[PDB]
């Protein structure tokens, strides 16, 4: 039946990190051999399984969250980590059971003017539940008098966008991330 992994990995438009797209995978046969024959920059890290042992298993439901983050924030996409991407954008749970796949895209997400299409939620009231998604652009009041809708001055705009110029450093280029999370799907 050949589970759609090319529908998640090869999708050209990856959503922003605050609004990561989740693709339910079920009722098929997943061939994981296209996930360890990789090009030499991929970062196939699994938490709870091992990469060479994914074929001889069956999972109930497989979820594939995909987004775009900075290079030094791939470390934030890990179970039980605290930063900005983990705290306010994408919290993996404490008991993670899947794999975290990230590759360099200094291409594909990088204009010479800089692609401001990718946004990360810099300010939030509270930290996120695991696998929670807060897509709203609501103004976060951060001090004395919470006013109606005035922008700025302790009434900030939360979703500050990245800047992804191709002359930035290795830890700042946009690293496309796909997070597999784990009976129907088999091998």
């Amino acid at each position, epitope marked *: 039946n050949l589970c759609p992994f090319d*529908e998640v990995f*090869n*999708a*050209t438009r*990856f959503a922003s990190v605050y609004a990561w797209n989740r693709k339910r995978i079920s009722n098929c046969v997943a061939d994981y051999s296209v996930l360890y024959n990789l090009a030499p920059f991929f970062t196939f890290k699994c938490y709870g399984v091992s990469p060479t042992k994914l074929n001889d298993l069956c999972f109930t439901n497989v979820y594939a969250d995909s987004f775009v983050i900075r290079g030094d924030e791939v470390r934030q996409i890990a179970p039980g980590q605290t930063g900005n991407i983990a705290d306010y954008n994408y919290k993996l749970p404490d008991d993670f059971t899947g794999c975290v796949i990230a590759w360099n895209s200094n*291409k*594909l997400d990088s204009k010479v003017s800089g692609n401001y299409n990718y946004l990360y939620r810099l300010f939030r009231k509270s930290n996120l539940k695991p696998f929670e998604r807060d897509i709203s652009t609501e103004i976060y009041q951060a001090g004395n008098k919470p006013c109606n809708g005035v922008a700025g001055f302790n009434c900030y705009f939360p979703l500050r966008s990245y800047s992804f110029r191709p002359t930035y450093g290795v830890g700042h280029q946009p690293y*496309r991330v796909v997070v597999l999370s784990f009976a129907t799907v088999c091998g």
Partner: antibody
Amino acid sequence: VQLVQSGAEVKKPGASVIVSCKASGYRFISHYIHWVRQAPGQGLEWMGKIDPSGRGTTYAQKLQGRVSVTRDTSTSSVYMALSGLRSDDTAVYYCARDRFPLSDPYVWGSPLGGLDVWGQGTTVIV
Amino acid sequence: DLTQPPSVSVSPGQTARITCSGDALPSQYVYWYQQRPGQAPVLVMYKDSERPPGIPERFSGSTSGTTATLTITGVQAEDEADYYCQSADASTTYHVFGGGTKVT
């Protein structure tokens, strides 16, 4: 950059096309090449894509097993091979570029499509 | 698979909104081609927001949702041509074109 096409031709239902796309100028091992046909007065519809470095072929879902492309590194050209014409398969065959200068071999999720430097087009008649 | 209105009609100076809707387009770029009747199509509009060189600064694009739109502000008399949207399938294979909207 420019892409050279074959001439107009009239065929019979059976052995049909070795239509050629002689490319020039650009580095041939960089961009994909898409083939698109158009029935006269109808919408464009996409047939197949070829990687000139031999890294894979992919043809359309409703045209599978009937059309096959053929690469050639030496002459910097790419061919088709379709068999068994009908009146449905009377069209103008467009060879196109891909408009993506990939430097490092393939980052996953390149914007394939974006057919920029379309060839002059050649015609099949049944 | 990508569906598109068959034709639109416009008088010059107005605003024409060509639209393209597809179920396999939350995650794929949309590339617009402007085929005048008789010759090979040209990429008029690409990657949902970007503009190739050789195009006047009038051809915009928007893909808010799963329905890409092109917008012509101040249609002139030489923009009477077909407008095929494009995508792929949801993976990247089997590229699909559109309905073939005629602009008059």
